[PDB]
Amino acid sequence: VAMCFSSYMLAAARQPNMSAKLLPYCILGFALSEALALFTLLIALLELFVFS
Amino acid sequence: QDPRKFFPDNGFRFFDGPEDSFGDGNIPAQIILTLTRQDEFILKQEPVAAITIRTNEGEMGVLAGHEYTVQQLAPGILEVEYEGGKKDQYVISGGFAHVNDTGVVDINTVEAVPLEEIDHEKLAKALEEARAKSQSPDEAVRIQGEIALEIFEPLEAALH
Amino acid sequence: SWRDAGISYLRYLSIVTRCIHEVQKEGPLLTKNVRFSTIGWKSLYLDHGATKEYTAIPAELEKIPE
């Protein structure tokens, strides 16, 4: 997550003009990185609340 | 007395440098290059597609709207590529590349000569001259040989 | 290396330029640009009435100022 954000922080620092075009790809890699934690929490919920 | 009859103008004002803005729009399609040796330019604000430098950290390349930077130039060759696919090589003697986010290049150098006016044959003798200088144990001639070889070896590999 | 030897970066550039002017072919370009590497200047400091050379900085590039 922060590695996805950190690259944006340096990038806009190194180039403010491109800060608008890189943000969709920070959002993309952020959501598609957090999805694996989402499915891990889904495993956490399925391991217990359906099994006895 | 007279109240300061003279008023010499600040000579810096005669030059018209860029106003490097943070960028509220798009990027240009081609860099605006301006090469300068000691005092006179060989290239003034020419549109160019790409340029490849040799630096101390390594060999770099640049396109339109490259990140804002400034750095040394290793004593070697410099490659340039226009929008027409052709190329132009220049042997250089150190310098400072000044790249901008707007897309602008100001490469201030000491010397800038085309490859066409150089012969490998004359370079050949100067090679072993530099090697003998480096092998001659003397701080006054050793470093001079190391530097002479530092400038011939890029040419030695660029010619071959 | 050459840095810690005492020579400057400016002597380094001028030495490289002096070396590059040798190898390039003979023509009007070299015929002009050798002027940009030949060393012919000097330095002087005025005595009470006489002229004397302030030789604390040599013009030749191999030497080291002191």
PDB file of N, CA, C and O in Angstrom, chain B residues 14 18 50 67 92 101 114 136 151:
ATOM      1  N   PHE B  14      20.455  40.367 -19.942  1.00  0.00           N
ATOM      2  CA  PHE B  14      20.456  40.265 -21.400  1.00  0.00           C
ATOM      3  C   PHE B  14      20.025  38.885 -21.871  1.00  0.00           C
ATOM      4  O   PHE B  14      19.474  38.749 -22.969  1.00  0.00           O
ATOM      5  N   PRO B  18      14.454  30.303 -19.205  1.00  0.00           N
ATOM      6  CA  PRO B  18      13.080  29.813 -19.092  1.00  0.00           C
ATOM      7  C   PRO B  18      12.491  30.103 -17.720  1.00  0.00           C
ATOM      8  O   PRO B  18      13.202  30.363 -16.747  1.00  0.00           O
ATOM      9  N   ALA B  50      15.075  13.143 -29.362  1.00  0.00           N
ATOM     10  CA  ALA B  50      15.681  12.441 -28.239  1.00  0.00           C
ATOM     11  C   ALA B  50      17.172  12.735 -28.187  1.00  0.00           C
ATOM     12  O   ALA B  50      17.773  13.196 -29.162  1.00  0.00           O
ATOM     13  N   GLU B  67      12.042  14.263 -16.294  1.00  0.00           N
ATOM     14  CA  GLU B  67      12.063  14.838 -14.958  1.00  0.00           C
ATOM     15  C   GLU B  67      13.137  15.914 -14.850  1.00  0.00           C
ATOM     16  O   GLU B  67      14.217  15.800 -15.436  1.00  0.00           O
ATOM     17  N   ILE B  92      32.613  15.673 -26.827  1.00  0.00           N
ATOM     18  CA  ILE B  92      32.476  16.735 -25.846  1.00  0.00           C
ATOM     19  C   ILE B  92      33.628  16.650 -24.856  1.00  0.00           C
ATOM     20  O   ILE B  92      34.326  15.639 -24.760  1.00  0.00           O
ATOM     21  N   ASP B 101      11.268  19.942 -16.686  1.00  0.00           N
ATOM     22  CA  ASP B 101       9.987  19.240 -16.762  1.00  0.00           C
ATOM     23  C   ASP B 101       9.135  19.742 -17.918  1.00  0.00           C
ATOM     24  O   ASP B 101       8.358  18.972 -18.494  1.00  0.00           O
ATOM     25  N   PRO B 114      32.090  17.594 -34.192  1.00  0.00           N
ATOM     26  CA  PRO B 114      31.510  16.404 -34.820  1.00  0.00           C
ATOM     27  C   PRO B 114      32.528  15.284 -34.958  1.00  0.00           C
ATOM     28  O   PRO B 114      33.742  15.482 -34.878  1.00  0.00           O
ATOM     29  N   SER B 136      54.251   5.824 -16.406  1.00  0.00           N
ATOM     30  CA  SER B 136      55.348   6.629 -15.891  1.00  0.00           C
ATOM     31  C   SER B 136      55.039   7.006 -14.444  1.00  0.00           C
ATOM     32  O   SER B 136      54.095   7.774 -14.211  1.00  0.00           O
ATOM     33  N   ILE B 151      39.602  10.072 -21.887  1.00  0.00           N
ATOM     34  CA  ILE B 151      38.951  10.722 -23.022  1.00  0.00           C
ATOM     35  C   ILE B 151      39.157   9.942 -24.321  1.00  0.00           C
ATOM     36  O   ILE B 151      38.320  10.052 -25.230  1.00  0.00           O
TER      37      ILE B 151
END
